[PDB]
Amino acid sequence: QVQLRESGPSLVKPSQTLSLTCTASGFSLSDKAVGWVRQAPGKALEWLGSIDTGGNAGYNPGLKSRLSITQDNSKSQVSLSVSTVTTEDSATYYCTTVHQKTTKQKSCPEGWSFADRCYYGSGSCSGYDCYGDGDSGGCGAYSSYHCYTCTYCYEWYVDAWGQGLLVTVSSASTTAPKVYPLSSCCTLGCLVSSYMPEPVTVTWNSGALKSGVHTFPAVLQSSGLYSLSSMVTVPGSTSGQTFTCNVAHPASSTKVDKAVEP
């Protein structure tokens, strides 16, 4: 079992270069390549690139302009570089081992005029090896197993995944949050807005109200700052009681109270 460990800074300022290192150990790492996969919060996994044993590197075309991947054989480390980072590059970066192999197999491409007399299916990766390239030349008036195209089959899958390293891109310094009340127009809450660098502790009525309270996880906004909300659900239809949330930020050494009322 091949072990992968990601190393690097957790916080990077925008317009700088995001650099990360992956320490790979294990015998099986020689066969397969080592790549990088990142996932922004609440987003799909995104492929970055990879480098094989021989030192050849391939990248995501939409990001190859900002990507550099190199490897140190003696330390068994693979490095990644993302240039001119924005707040969109905040993500969890996974070091991976990747299987990459290009093979030539028999298939029946869609636009091909002899595909209707070909048995190996439309998918390029049919599982039946061939040599040469293109139309076999053996297609006739009737269907035959000699009628096929020798196409490229691109095999790809991640073998092993690292635990991942969360990286945040923001130019902000430690900033005290601003607390605003959440009341309906015509449940209540407190908005803890634009703070750095987490966490914040939220109570209600100095701890006298804790049941029926749900404080959400924070979001990283395009400003480079964090924001969360705390929610209060009032039971029993009891009306006429003041509600006050207490927000404390350790980094700014701040404590703020905000009363909420219609």
């Binding site: 990248y59 299916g121 049919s126 790809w156 908005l191 807005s193 979001v219 906004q221 924001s227 929610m231």
Partner: protein, 215 residues
């Protein structure tokens, strides 16, 4: 770009669930699709590669298949540990380029279905006085724990400066989520209506605030 998957999929203990993954001829049409399982607090786990091959340590319940530009992951008998996010992937007209699916949250049912309670909060007077305006859409008491949020301004979808947390379990074992739309105090006063639309299991709950009347 991205391969399209359903946002959420649910089934009961011991039942069969399928998760689709549709792309194009340059990716899924190539015929070598993989599937990955993501559990919070744990590293991603490879389940399937090469359309139908099972990775080492993967149970027989998980199986894969493909038809044209659409692949499908199937779990014949569901168990408690199967609850997770599932992603598909495939090479993109090269061995060194790959694309992933949008991801599917799989829930094993353990309680009755509950629709989301949605409350859209206007920006406070104190924030407007600072020439800012943040709309907070708080979503609660829904099960299964997966929703999608669409923000609307005068019937027009807006996605700029929108942030949404993923569903978090409440004290009553139901799930809650939050969504934020950040505006200036001028953008707030310049529109006649803002709406938060929460879609849960094909059903949509909509709350609307009006900057003119809301004061």
């Amino acid at each position: 770009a991205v391969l399209n998957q359903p946002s959420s999929v649910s089934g009961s203990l011991g039942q069969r669930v399928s998760i689709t993954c549709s792309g194009s001829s340059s990716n899924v049409g190539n015929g070598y699709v993989s599937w990955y399982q993501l559990i919070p607090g744990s590293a991603p786990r490879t389940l399937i590669y090469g359309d139908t091959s099972r990775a080492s340590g993967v149970p027989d319940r998980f199986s894969g298949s493909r038809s044209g530009n659409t692949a499908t992951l199937t779990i014949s008998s569901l168990q408690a540990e199967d609850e997770a996010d599932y992603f598909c992937a495939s090479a993109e007209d090269s061995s060194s380029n790959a694309v992933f699916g949008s991801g599917t949250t799989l829930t094993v049912l353990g309680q009755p279905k509950s629709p989301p309670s949605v409350t859209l909060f206007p920006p406070s007077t104190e924030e407007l006085n600072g020439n800012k305006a943040t709309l907070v859409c708080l979503i609660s008491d829904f099960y299964p724990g997966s929703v999608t949020v669409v923000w609307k301004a005068d019937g027009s979808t807006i996605t700029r400066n929108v942030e949404t947390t993923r569903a978090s379990k409440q004290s009553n074992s139901k799930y809650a989520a939050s969504s934020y739309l950040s505006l200036t105090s001028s953008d707030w006063k310049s529109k006649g209506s803002y709406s938060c639309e929460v879609t849960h299991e094909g059903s949509t709950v909509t709350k609307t605030v009006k900057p003119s009347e809301c004061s």
